[PDB]
Symmetry: C3
Subunit: 110 residues, 3 copies
Protein backbone atom coordinates (compact mmCIF):
# COMPACT_ATOMS: atom_id res chain seq x y z
CA UNK A 1 0.00 0.00 0.00
CA UNK A 2 0.95 3.69 -0.06
CA UNK A 3 1.76 3.41 3.64
CA UNK A 4 1.73 0.79 6.39
CA UNK A 5 2.69 0.23 10.04
CA UNK A 6 6.34 -0.28 9.16
CA UNK A 7 9.06 -0.80 11.74
CA UNK A 8 10.50 2.69 12.21
CA UNK A 9 11.29 4.19 15.58
CA UNK A 10 11.94 7.81 16.44
CA UNK A 11 14.46 8.55 19.15
CA UNK A 12 14.69 12.01 20.68
CA UNK A 13 17.50 13.62 22.65
CA UNK A 14 18.91 17.07 23.39
CA UNK A 15 22.46 18.38 23.14
CA UNK A 16 24.36 21.42 24.48
CA UNK A 17 24.88 22.99 21.06
CA UNK A 18 24.50 22.73 17.29
CA UNK A 19 28.05 21.46 16.83
CA UNK A 20 27.63 18.50 19.21
CA UNK A 21 24.21 17.57 17.84
CA UNK A 22 25.52 17.45 14.26
CA UNK A 23 28.73 15.66 15.21
CA UNK A 24 26.85 12.90 17.01
CA UNK A 25 24.30 12.68 14.21
CA UNK A 26 27.16 12.17 11.76
CA UNK A 27 28.77 9.51 13.92
CA UNK A 28 25.47 7.63 14.14
CA UNK A 29 25.15 7.71 10.34
CA UNK A 30 28.74 6.48 9.95
CA UNK A 31 27.81 3.42 11.99
CA UNK A 32 24.55 2.91 10.10
CA UNK A 33 22.61 3.22 13.37
CA UNK A 34 20.24 5.84 12.00
CA UNK A 35 19.06 6.61 8.49
CA UNK A 36 18.62 10.31 9.17
CA UNK A 37 18.52 12.96 11.88
CA UNK A 38 16.59 16.23 12.10
CA UNK A 39 17.97 18.73 14.57
CA UNK A 40 16.56 22.05 15.72
CA UNK A 41 17.30 24.78 18.25
CA UNK A 42 15.34 24.71 21.50
CA UNK A 43 15.01 26.66 24.73
CA UNK A 44 14.77 24.42 27.77
CA UNK A 45 13.86 24.66 31.42
CA UNK A 46 14.38 22.21 34.28
CA UNK A 47 15.49 21.96 37.90
CA UNK A 48 19.18 22.15 38.71
CA UNK A 49 20.58 22.36 42.23
CA UNK A 50 17.28 23.50 43.70
CA UNK A 51 16.57 26.21 41.15
CA UNK A 52 14.64 26.47 37.90
CA UNK A 53 17.04 27.29 35.10
CA UNK A 54 16.67 28.33 31.48
CA UNK A 55 18.96 26.84 28.88
CA UNK A 56 19.58 26.89 25.13
CA UNK A 57 20.19 23.56 23.43
CA UNK A 58 19.73 21.67 20.20
CA UNK A 59 17.26 18.82 20.00
CA UNK A 60 17.43 16.02 17.48
CA UNK A 61 15.11 13.30 16.32
CA UNK A 62 16.79 10.16 15.05
CA UNK A 63 14.99 7.99 12.52
CA UNK A 64 15.94 4.32 12.35
CA UNK A 65 14.50 0.79 12.45
CA UNK A 66 13.33 -1.18 15.50
CA UNK A 67 16.25 -3.56 14.95
CA UNK A 68 18.74 -0.75 15.61
CA UNK A 69 17.11 0.59 18.80
CA UNK A 70 19.33 -1.22 21.32
CA UNK A 71 22.51 -0.31 19.44
CA UNK A 72 21.35 3.29 19.00
CA UNK A 73 20.74 3.72 22.73
CA UNK A 74 24.17 2.25 23.47
CA UNK A 75 25.95 4.54 21.00
CA UNK A 76 24.06 7.60 22.29
CA UNK A 77 24.94 6.69 25.89
CA UNK A 78 28.56 6.40 24.72
CA UNK A 79 28.70 9.76 22.94
CA UNK A 80 26.43 11.94 25.05
CA UNK A 81 28.06 14.92 26.78
CA UNK A 82 25.41 14.88 29.53
CA UNK A 83 25.61 12.62 32.57
CA UNK A 84 21.84 12.00 32.55
CA UNK A 85 20.70 12.83 28.99
CA UNK A 86 17.14 12.77 27.75
CA UNK A 87 16.80 9.79 25.42
CA UNK A 88 13.42 8.29 24.64
CA UNK A 89 11.53 6.71 21.75
CA UNK A 90 8.21 7.84 20.28
CA UNK A 91 5.68 5.49 18.70
CA UNK A 92 5.35 5.55 14.90
CA UNK A 93 1.93 4.29 13.73
CA UNK A 94 2.25 4.45 9.93
CA UNK A 95 4.91 5.34 7.39
CA UNK A 96 5.07 5.94 3.65
CA UNK A 97 6.07 2.55 2.23
CA UNK A 98 8.78 3.89 -0.10
CA UNK A 99 10.29 5.85 2.77
CA UNK A 100 10.30 2.77 4.99
CA UNK A 101 12.22 0.99 2.25
CA UNK A 102 14.70 3.87 2.15
CA UNK A 103 15.12 3.69 5.93
CA UNK A 104 15.85 -0.03 5.76
CA UNK A 105 18.39 0.40 2.95
CA UNK A 106 19.99 3.33 4.79
CA UNK A 107 20.69 1.31 7.93
CA UNK A 108 21.84 -1.89 6.23
CA UNK A 109 25.40 -2.53 7.35
CA UNK A 110 27.58 -1.11 10.13
Amino acid sequence: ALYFMGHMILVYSTFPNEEKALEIGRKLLEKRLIACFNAFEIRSGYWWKGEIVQDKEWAAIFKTTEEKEKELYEELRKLHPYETPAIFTLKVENILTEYMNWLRESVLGS
Copy 2:
Protein backbone atom coordinates in the same frame (compact mmCIF):
# COMPACT_ATOMS: atom_id res chain seq x y z
CA ALA B 1 -13.93 15.00 30.38
CA LEU B 2 -11.22 17.67 30.10
CA TYR B 3 -9.36 15.35 27.73
CA PHE B 4 -9.78 11.90 26.18
CA MET B 5 -8.20 9.52 23.65
CA GLY B 6 -9.73 11.37 20.72
CA HIS B 7 -9.05 10.48 17.10
CA MET B 8 -6.27 12.88 16.12
CA ILE B 9 -3.21 11.84 14.16
CA LEU B 10 0.03 13.72 13.74
CA VAL B 11 1.82 13.42 10.42
CA TYR B 12 5.41 14.57 10.04
CA SER B 13 7.39 15.41 6.92
CA THR B 14 10.31 17.59 5.85
CA PHE B 15 10.60 20.07 2.99
CA PRO B 16 13.48 21.80 1.16
CA ASN B 17 12.59 25.28 2.42
CA GLU B 18 10.20 27.50 4.36
CA GLU B 19 8.35 28.57 1.22
CA LYS B 20 7.50 25.01 0.13
CA ALA B 21 6.52 23.91 3.63
CA LEU B 22 4.08 26.81 4.01
CA GLU B 23 2.70 26.47 0.49
CA ILE B 24 1.91 22.79 0.97
CA GLY B 25 0.50 23.45 4.43
CA ARG B 26 -1.83 26.03 2.88
CA LYS B 27 -2.90 23.66 0.12
CA LEU B 28 -3.70 20.97 2.69
CA LEU B 29 -5.85 23.44 4.64
CA GLU B 30 -7.65 24.50 1.45
CA LYS B 31 -8.69 20.89 0.94
CA ARG B 32 -9.67 20.46 4.60
CA LEU B 33 -7.16 17.61 4.93
CA ILE B 34 -5.52 19.10 8.01
CA ALA B 35 -6.82 21.41 10.70
CA CYS B 36 -3.43 22.99 11.33
CA PHE B 37 0.28 22.72 10.62
CA ASN B 38 3.30 23.71 12.71
CA ALA B 39 6.52 24.13 10.76
CA PHE B 40 10.04 24.75 12.00
CA GLU B 41 13.56 25.00 10.63
CA ILE B 42 15.77 21.93 10.94
CA ARG B 43 19.28 20.78 10.11
CA SER B 44 19.37 17.28 8.67
CA GLY B 45 21.89 14.57 7.92
CA TYR B 46 21.58 11.40 5.86
CA TRP B 47 23.36 9.28 3.26
CA TRP B 48 23.38 10.43 -0.34
CA LYS B 49 25.41 8.78 -3.10
CA GLY B 50 27.73 7.06 -0.64
CA GLU B 51 28.45 10.10 1.49
CA ILE B 52 27.05 11.63 4.66
CA VAL B 53 25.63 15.03 3.87
CA GLN B 54 24.35 17.94 5.93
CA ASP B 55 21.25 19.78 4.81
CA LYS B 56 18.95 22.60 5.90
CA GLU B 57 15.22 22.01 5.63
CA TRP B 58 11.89 22.86 7.17
CA ALA B 59 9.94 20.22 9.04
CA ALA B 60 6.21 20.31 9.59
CA ILE B 61 3.76 18.46 11.76
CA PHE B 62 0.26 18.15 10.37
CA LYS B 63 -2.66 17.78 12.76
CA THR B 64 -5.80 16.10 11.46
CA THR B 65 -8.28 13.29 12.18
CA GLU B 66 -7.82 9.55 11.61
CA GLU B 67 -10.50 9.74 8.92
CA LYS B 68 -8.30 12.05 6.82
CA GLU B 69 -5.08 10.01 7.07
CA LYS B 70 -5.37 8.18 3.74
CA GLU B 71 -6.30 11.35 1.87
CA LEU B 72 -3.54 13.31 3.61
CA TYR B 73 -0.89 10.80 2.58
CA GLU B 74 -2.16 10.89 -1.00
CA GLU B 75 -2.12 14.69 -1.17
CA LEU B 76 1.36 14.85 0.39
CA ARG B 77 2.64 12.25 -2.10
CA LYS B 78 1.12 14.42 -4.84
CA LEU B 79 2.68 17.70 -3.71
CA HIS B 80 6.02 16.61 -2.30
CA PRO B 81 9.13 17.94 -4.07
CA TYR B 82 11.18 14.92 -2.92
CA GLU B 83 11.17 11.60 -4.75
CA THR B 84 11.30 9.63 -1.48
CA PRO B 85 10.01 12.03 1.20
CA ALA B 86 9.82 11.31 4.90
CA ILE B 87 6.14 10.94 5.79
CA PHE B 88 5.05 9.11 8.91
CA THR B 89 2.41 9.30 11.63
CA LEU B 90 2.96 9.55 15.38
CA LYS B 91 0.60 8.12 17.97
CA VAL B 92 -1.57 10.57 19.93
CA GLU B 93 -2.69 9.14 23.30
CA ASN B 94 -4.88 11.94 24.69
CA ILE B 95 -6.14 15.32 23.57
CA LEU B 96 -7.91 18.28 25.14
CA THR B 97 -11.60 17.63 24.38
CA GLU B 98 -12.38 21.16 23.19
CA TYR B 99 -9.37 21.06 20.88
CA MET B 100 -10.47 17.71 19.46
CA ASN B 101 -13.83 19.32 18.69
CA TRP B 102 -12.03 22.18 16.94
CA LEU B 103 -9.99 19.70 14.90
CA ARG B 104 -13.13 17.89 13.79
CA GLU B 105 -14.89 21.13 12.82
CA SER B 106 -11.76 22.33 11.02
CA VAL B 107 -11.59 19.31 8.73
CA LEU B 108 -15.30 19.02 7.99
CA GLY B 109 -15.72 19.41 4.25
CA SER B 110 -13.32 19.32 1.31
Copy 3:
Protein backbone atom coordinates in the same frame (compact mmCIF):
# COMPACT_ATOMS: atom_id res chain seq x y z
CA ALA C 1 18.26 -2.45 31.66
CA LEU C 2 19.75 0.51 29.76
CA TYR C 3 16.20 1.51 28.82
CA PHE C 4 12.64 0.31 29.37
CA MET C 5 9.00 1.25 28.73
CA GLY C 6 8.96 3.69 31.63
CA HIS C 7 6.00 5.89 32.48
CA MET C 8 6.84 9.18 30.77
CA ILE C 9 4.35 11.19 28.77
CA LEU C 10 5.04 14.00 26.34
CA VAL C 11 2.53 16.82 26.16
CA TYR C 12 2.62 19.30 23.30
CA SER C 13 1.09 22.76 23.02
CA THR C 14 1.69 26.05 21.21
CA PHE C 15 1.88 29.59 22.56
CA PRO C 16 1.68 33.10 21.05
CA ASN C 17 5.31 33.96 21.79
CA GLU C 18 8.61 32.96 23.38
CA GLU C 19 7.88 34.92 26.55
CA LYS C 20 4.57 33.16 27.27
CA ALA C 21 5.96 29.72 26.45
CA LEU C 22 8.87 30.16 28.87
CA GLU C 23 6.72 31.74 31.58
CA ILE C 24 4.26 28.86 31.54
CA GLY C 25 7.06 26.32 31.39
CA ARG C 26 8.55 27.91 34.50
CA LYS C 27 5.22 27.89 36.32
CA LEU C 28 4.77 24.20 35.52
CA LEU C 29 8.23 23.45 36.93
CA GLU C 30 7.46 25.47 40.07
CA LYS C 31 4.49 23.19 40.70
CA ARG C 32 6.49 20.05 39.92
CA LEU C 33 4.04 19.19 37.13
CA ILE C 34 6.77 18.70 34.54
CA ALA C 35 10.41 17.73 34.85
CA CYS C 36 11.47 19.70 31.80
CA PHE C 37 10.22 21.61 28.77
CA ASN C 38 11.74 22.10 25.32
CA ALA C 39 10.38 25.04 23.38
CA PHE C 40 11.02 26.09 19.79
CA GLU C 41 9.82 28.67 17.30
CA ILE C 42 7.23 27.56 14.76
CA ARG C 43 5.25 28.94 11.84
CA SER C 44 1.63 27.84 11.88
CA GLY C 45 -1.36 27.80 9.59
CA TYR C 46 -5.04 27.15 10.30
CA TRP C 47 -8.54 28.39 9.55
CA TRP C 48 -9.79 31.52 11.26
CA LYS C 49 -13.06 33.26 10.42
CA GLY C 50 -13.33 31.56 7.05
CA GLU C 51 -9.79 32.26 5.91
CA ILE C 52 -6.47 30.44 6.00
CA VAL C 53 -4.03 32.41 8.10
CA GLN C 54 -0.31 32.22 8.75
CA ASP C 55 0.99 32.75 12.26
CA LYS C 56 4.23 32.73 14.23
CA GLU C 57 4.22 30.96 17.58
CA TRP C 58 6.35 29.00 19.99
CA ALA C 59 5.72 25.31 20.53
CA ALA C 60 6.73 23.40 23.62
CA ILE C 61 6.97 19.78 24.57
CA PHE C 62 6.48 19.02 28.24
CA LYS C 63 8.09 15.94 29.75
CA THR C 64 6.52 14.45 32.86
CA THR C 65 5.15 11.22 34.33
CA GLU C 66 1.79 9.55 33.64
CA GLU C 67 0.78 10.34 37.22
CA LYS C 68 0.98 14.08 36.52
CA GLU C 69 -1.00 14.07 33.26
CA LYS C 70 -4.38 15.09 34.70
CA GLU C 71 -2.85 17.86 36.80
CA LEU C 72 -0.72 19.05 33.87
CA TYR C 73 -3.75 19.37 31.60
CA GLU C 74 -5.61 21.29 34.30
CA GLU C 75 -2.73 23.70 34.89
CA LEU C 76 -2.25 24.24 31.15
CA ARG C 77 -5.98 24.91 30.72
CA LYS C 78 -5.66 27.41 33.57
CA LEU C 79 -2.66 29.29 32.17
CA HIS C 80 -3.23 29.12 28.43
CA PRO C 81 -3.75 32.44 26.63
CA TYR C 82 -5.78 30.72 23.88
CA GLU C 83 -9.48 29.96 24.21
CA THR C 84 -9.10 26.62 22.38
CA PRO C 85 -5.41 25.71 22.70
CA ALA C 86 -3.74 22.70 21.15
CA ILE C 87 -2.89 20.30 23.98
CA PHE C 88 -2.28 16.63 23.32
CA THR C 89 -0.08 13.78 24.51
CA LEU C 90 2.26 11.63 22.42
CA LYS C 91 3.07 8.01 23.18
CA VAL C 92 6.52 7.24 24.61
CA GLU C 93 7.59 3.62 23.92
CA ASN C 94 10.98 3.43 25.67
CA ILE C 95 13.17 5.68 27.76
CA LEU C 96 16.73 5.64 29.08
CA THR C 97 16.37 4.18 32.59
CA GLU C 98 18.57 6.77 34.31
CA TYR C 99 16.61 9.56 32.63
CA MET C 100 13.32 8.03 33.75
CA ASN C 101 14.67 8.08 37.30
CA TRP C 102 15.59 11.74 36.88
CA LEU C 103 12.08 12.51 35.59
CA ARG C 104 10.52 10.83 38.61
CA GLU C 105 12.78 12.67 41.06
CA SER C 106 12.14 15.95 39.23
CA VAL C 107 8.37 15.75 39.65
CA LEU C 108 8.31 14.48 43.22
CA GLY C 109 6.46 17.06 45.29
CA SER C 110 4.24 20.02 44.43
